[PDB]
Amino acid sequence: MVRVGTIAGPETQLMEVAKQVALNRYGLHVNIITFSDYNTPNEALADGSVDANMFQHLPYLKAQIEMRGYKIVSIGKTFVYPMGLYSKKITALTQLKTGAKIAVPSDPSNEARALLLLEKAQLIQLKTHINATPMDIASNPKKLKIVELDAAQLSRSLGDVDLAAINTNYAIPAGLSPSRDALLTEGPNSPYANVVAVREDDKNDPRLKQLVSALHSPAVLSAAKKIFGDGAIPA
Numbered sequence: 001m002v003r004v005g006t007i008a009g010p011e012t013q014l015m016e017v018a019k020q021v022a023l024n025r026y027g028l029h030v031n032i033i034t035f036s037d038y039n040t041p042n043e044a045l046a047d048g049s050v051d052a053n054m055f056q057h058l059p060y061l062k063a064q065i066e067m068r069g070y071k072i073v074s075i076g077k078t079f080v081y082p083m084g085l086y087s088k089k090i091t092a093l094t095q096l097k098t099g100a101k102i103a104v105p106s107d108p109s110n111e112a113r114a115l116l117l118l119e120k121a122q123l124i125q126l127k128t129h130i131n132a133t134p135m136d137i138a139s140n141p142k143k144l145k146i147v148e149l150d151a152a153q154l155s156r157s158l159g160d161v162d163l164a165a166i167n168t169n170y171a172i173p174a175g176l177s178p179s180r181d182a183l184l185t186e187g188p189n190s191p192y193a194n195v196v197a198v199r200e201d202d203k204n205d206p207r208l209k210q211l212v213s214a215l216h217s218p219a220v221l222s223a224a225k226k227i228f229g230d231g232a233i234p235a
């Protein structure tokens with residue numbers, strides 16, 4: 001059968017519904033292999049442990065390919081999950097004090113993403129002209145302090161920071177809703193739609209293409225609504 005890698009949590013639930021559709025509508029057997037770190041499913045795909053994965057956006061894929069040299073490609077988009085800014089210390093962004101701590105993901109692409117969101121929030125300005133680092137902060141009026149944490153740690157940081165940019169797959173299990181709890185989220189038209197990735201040699205495999213189709217099925221869209229609400233947008 002087809003082995004597909006996901007990150008444990010809400011997206012794995014989504015994949016469970018896709019797996020049912022795959023069997024019932026496509027006669028395809030899908031075995032879901034869960035992981036607990038963003039940095040792992042691409043290694044599992046590269047080494048043959050899984051045949052596809054569904055957990056990342058294109059900038060993340062490009063970044064890890066540059067780091068590791070994996071021969072992996074996207075065969076289609078699933079959903080975009082607009083990233084939110086969350087806090088347990090403020091209800092409005094203007095409440096931020098001088099020198100407040102803002103936590104962001106520490107991996108290159110999601111860190112750049114979070115910095116772009118802080119800029120959208122009018123908290124900072126980045127040097128003029130996807131790979132942004134705090135060194136690219138040109139304006140920081142409130143002298144906010146950027147704290148770089150692993151993505152899976154951000155949801156537990158809210159007792160120690162004033163604001164955090166958190167990926168939706170991690171926010172939800174922490175009881176945080178992008179629609180209900182975020183002070184601000186990205187727009188829907190970002191470069192961060194998630195994808196199904198496969199080995200380069202398998203890009204034309206009809207069974208892997210069928211997984212993409214199943215993930216666009218009415219049943220999967222309906223399940224996305226129940227799991228993510230407005231926090232997931234079909235892509």
Ligand code: MET
Pocket residue numbers: 038055056057060080081083110167168169192194
């Ligand atoms: C591993 S790249 C980030 C993926 C995560 N599901 C997001 O859309 O924010």
